[PDB]
Amino acid sequence: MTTQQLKEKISKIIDNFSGIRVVFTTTANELKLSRIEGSALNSIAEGFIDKIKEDIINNEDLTSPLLSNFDDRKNALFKFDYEQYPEEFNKITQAIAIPPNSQDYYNPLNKFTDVKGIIILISGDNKCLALYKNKTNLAVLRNSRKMFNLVPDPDGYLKQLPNEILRLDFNYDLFSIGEDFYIKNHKTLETQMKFHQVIEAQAVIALNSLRDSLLIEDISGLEKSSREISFARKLAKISKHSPVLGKIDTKTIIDYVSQHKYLSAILQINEAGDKLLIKTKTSQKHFIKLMSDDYLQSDLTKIIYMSIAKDRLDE
Amino acid sequence: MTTQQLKEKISKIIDNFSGIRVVFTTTANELKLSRIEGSALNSIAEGFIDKIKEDIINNEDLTSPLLSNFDDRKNALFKFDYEQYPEEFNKITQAIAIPPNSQDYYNPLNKFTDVKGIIILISGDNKCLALYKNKTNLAVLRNSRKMFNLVPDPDGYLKQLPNEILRLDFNYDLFSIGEDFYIKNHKTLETQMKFHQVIEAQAVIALNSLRDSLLIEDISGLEKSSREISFARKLAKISKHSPVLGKIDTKTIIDYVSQHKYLSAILQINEAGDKLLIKTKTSQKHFIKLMSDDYLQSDLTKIIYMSIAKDRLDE
Amino acid sequence: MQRNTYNKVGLYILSLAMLFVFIIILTAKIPFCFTSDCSFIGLKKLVLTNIVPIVCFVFFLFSIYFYNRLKNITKYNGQDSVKITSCQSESYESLTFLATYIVPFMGFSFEDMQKNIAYLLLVVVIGIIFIKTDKYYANPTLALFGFKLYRVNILHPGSGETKNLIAISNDVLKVDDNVYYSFFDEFVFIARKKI
């Protein structure tokens, strides 16, 4: 699955647009079809295909790696590769198979409090592209107070009238075509899908592999640092895609730390020279970015660089 | 070159929080203060404090590179090092120094159509930080239906009723602290406040320097590709921080594309062996990424990587 | 003109509520008799013998409405703070509004209607001079309800300092006693004393 194939699929979907429908997932985990009207469907669909075209079609700098090779980079749709599928993944794969004559409708008396997920189903090239987004904390809109009797008040305040009306903004979190998933907003993946247990499991698996590598005297700072998900995503990246763990022996990494111009100053070596000392959070993140193979030296100007975002060219 | 100064400044701003003021800017380029309700303003202050805590205070992966060093990384605040301040930045620095007894309050009879951007003046410990936002044409938030004949109305007819309510989300596009500007969303720069002219002039200067360097044979394809602003930004980053243009000679660049594994396949040499044959768009973007030193090689693993985002260490 | 003048006229009508209460207490010819032969004379002559309590009653509801608008000017905004550099109490400028401008009205005899036209003209003339007199923050009705009128010199964290402002507040103030503003005009703001 390459980026150009996904671009061609999205272009064929958009250039042969046929239909549009909106699905809701509530807190009791059922799919209910909404009653959103046709002119509003046309406006929302035009804006959403505009967002897709600015995000996929007219975007000329898309790369699509996996979430196990995660790094903090913009303008990229991370393809799902993990084995365990969350429950909302099952809900959206049921949602693309919902028949057009389904009578499971949405009750409008729920005050939009039960609904926690919105589904945009665009249709093209006999395909149903699914966009899943959530509901935020209403992202509150403001109304000028036209409440003397009907229509005057050029002195009133801006205050929140409805406090229940859903927004449906021009933003999506994840999108799926076929059995292929891509995630743009990973924050709602981590907190709302409750994915942080899986990332913590990969983190303690990578910590056990670090203990098997015989490289660290004490992982207590790494243990108390792995509870935050920011260290845990890089721990999962170390667990899966690191070319240092399980491939390079301990003495080579210690020797390369020893003659390095910046790693020798912070990541100190112990008295016996058999392991590497790590206690501070600066040394913690430096060990994380060292094991992730990011201290990379130029072959032309011989300048060492910190690569936040890297991609393999030969694969 | 570090991020600790802004982190300490935002710690003093938020930890000694004093007050918040909402100032609207107008399409006729003048500032009108607003009439936000106090409970809703307290909610806005709490949410913006929470967002600036989740992005600056509680964040650990936050880097602050230069805007001239534009790369495609996330969690990055770009420092405004350019020599020309646009109009809205001057309006922000005017809006900081508005005296509190000012009486040019906004008129809500204008129905929120003349407002272009929303400025939020979060203040703390005798300093004022100004966040900025763009009114994104109501981002087409659909609304529910409350039919006149009854109060619950059990019939789904959800349409956007007023079309004049203000959105005011919790995502800020740029901000200012002290006498310095930091930038989050560069699409706000390019589309709203028209920053692309200076970038196109810098791309013109880059093309002049590329003509004078005599590395390329035909520059007309690059001059055609310079029209796109997504290419003009990286031509500007070539014009400012290319580490191999003007500091090393052309012959070692020809050797470096000659005996490279990937770059010999696409970036072709001419028959005279002095100028490159770069005509296609893939060869064009490979030429640009080679000017940014993105074909970047490892030392411990000795693996060549495609460095999308990189920095010159020095933490 | 207009809006600023209307705000100052509203503050002046708020300043006169105790006068309307005093006139209603003073010259209401209500037959307060518990006797059995004290039948109702009728609504018409009860209205006609109590003309100036009726007029002062209508003006009392106008003062109540302008107090409601003065509370509406502090309902909406007021989520920003300043620092006070020079606080000098000026609550006594409220009380001299009482004993010179409301006290001598009760010495008059509100019996003949020509004299009442003269006193109404005096109220109107005092109001016209009192709008532009730069001491329009004087108030018996506001200073009755716990509010104190101070002369402060606030200092903003980002804009600078402004001199000679008048602060209507609920609690006692001093130097370095940060407050929230709810600015009414370019002269008078309602403080709240952020603790």
Side-chain angles (χ1 to χ4, degrees), chain A residues 24 34-40 43-44 60-61 72-75 108-109 112 139-144 146 152 154-160 164-170 186-187 230 234 243-244 248 252-253 256 260 262 266 281 285-286 289 293 295-301 303-314, chain B residues 24 34-37 39-41 43-44 60-61 63 72-75 107-109 112 139-144 152-160 164-170 184-185 228 231 243-244 248 252-253 256 261-262 281 293 295-315:
Chain A
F24 292 164
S34 149
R35 267 275 327 168
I36 171 77
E37 272 67 31
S39 85
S43 71
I44 289 181
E60 285 228 30
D61 40 352
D72 318 328
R73 86 220 215 193
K74 214 87 144 157
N75 197 315
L109 315 174
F112 294 113
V140 58
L141 55 99
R142 325 301 270 271
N143 179 18
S144 162
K146 207 60 96 160
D155 258 352
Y157 26 79
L158 273 73
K159 99 201 205 177
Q160 332 159 74
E164 103 283 349
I165 289 186
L166 205 77
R167 83 201 210 100
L168 213 4
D169 67 331
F170 276 2
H186 40 275
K187 289 308 193 337
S230 63
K234 319 197 225 67
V244 185
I248 314 184
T252 314
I253 318 144
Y256 262 80
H260 202 278
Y262 209 94
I266 294 185
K281 74 162 186 145
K285 65 211 213 314
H286 277 53
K289 67 185 89 170
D293 194 38
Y295 289 96
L296 315 179
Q297 36 93 26
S298 158
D299 277 346
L300 200 50
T301 53
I303 304 178
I304 326 168
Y305 297 100
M306 189 24 46
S307 171
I308 301 173
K310 56 169 197 204
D311 293 310
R312 157 88 277 193
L313 295 158
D314 295 343
Chain B
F24 291 155
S34 204
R35 306 253 186 87
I36 304 303
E37 184 148 280
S39 150
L41 200 43
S43 161
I44 286 312
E60 197 41 66
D61 313 58
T63 87
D72 206 314
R73 60 168 103 169
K74 262 221 171 36
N75 305 60
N107 168 231
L109 263 202
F112 297 140
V140 200
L141 318 186
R142 56 139 270 280
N143 303 120
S144 183
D153 302 302
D155 39 355
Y157 261 97
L158 329 168
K159 299 285 263 211
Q160 41 206 22
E164 43 96 39
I165 43 189
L166 184 33
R167 172 142 189 258
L168 199 143
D169 214 294
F170 288 73
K184 192 143 170 313
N185 264 17
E228 319 192 21
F231 291 12
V244 305
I248 79 175
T252 174
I253 294 170
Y256 188 77
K261 158 72 64 181
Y262 185 19
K281 42 185 77 207
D293 203 20
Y295 291 84
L296 167 40
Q297 145 75 359
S298 148
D299 46 71
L300 177 85
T301 79
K302 298 285 197 294
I303 294 176
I304 315 109
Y305 270 122
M306 192 23 47
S307 197
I308 285 288
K310 33 164 281 179
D311 216 17
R312 287 211 29 196
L313 320 171
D314 297 336
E315 34 254 48

Side-chain angles (χ1 to χ4, degrees), chain B residues 18-21 34-39 41-42 96-103 105 121 123-124 126-128, chain C residues 4 75-83 154-160 162 165 180-181 183-187 194:
Chain B
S18 34
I20 177 174
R21 198 155 27 112
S34 204
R35 306 253 186 87
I36 304 303
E37 184 148 280
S39 150
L41 200 43
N42 175 67
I96 285 287
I98 280 194
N101 52 42
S102 160
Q103 280 277 341
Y105 280 162
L121 290 208
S123 43
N126 311 74
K127 293 213 272 293
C128 260
Chain C
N4 241 13
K75 183 179 301 285
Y76 48 97
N77 223 335
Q79 293 295 320
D80 190 90
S81 90
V82 277
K83 284 216 63 99
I154 75 175
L155 164 151
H156 211 265
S159 153
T162 62
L165 288 178
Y180 288 164
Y181 40 55
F183 262 105
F184 186 70
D185 313 325
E186 324 193 90
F187 198 42
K194 181 218 67 200

Side-chain angles (χ1 to χ4, degrees), chain B residues 66-82:
Chain B
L66 271 78
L67 180 61
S68 313
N69 207 2
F70 165 42
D71 43 358
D72 206 314
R73 60 168 103 169
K74 262 221 171 36
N75 305 60
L77 295 176
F78 290 82
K79 188 169 294 163
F80 198 89
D81 71 313
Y82 265 25

Side-chain angles (χ1 to χ4, degrees), chain B residues 102-155:
Chain B
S102 160
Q103 280 277 341
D104 46 356
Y105 280 162
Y106 191 77
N107 168 231
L109 263 202
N110 250 1
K111 310 155 297 303
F112 297 140
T113 61
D114 263 289
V115 46
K116 186 158 147 56
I118 298 123
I119 304 178
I120 295 105
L121 290 208
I122 283 173
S123 43
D125 209 17
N126 311 74
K127 293 213 272 293
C128 260
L129 171 152
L131 311 154
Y132 186 87
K133 272 189 53 60
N134 324 110
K135 190 203 142 26
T136 167
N137 203 9
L138 226 149
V140 200
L141 318 186
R142 56 139 270 280
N143 303 120
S144 183
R145 155 62 41 71
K146 191 188 169 240
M147 172 55 158
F148 145 75
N149 89 286
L150 194 61
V151 293
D153 302 302
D155 39 355

Side-chain angles (χ1 to χ4, degrees), chain C residues 105-124:
Chain C
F105 269 114
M106 321 195 311
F108 303 149
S109 199
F110 291 89
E111 213 85 20
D112 206 26
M113 201 66 28
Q114 211 152 46
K115 320 236 191 305
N116 305 131
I117 294 172
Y119 308 143
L120 181 56
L121 219 64
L122 174 65
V123 162
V124 166

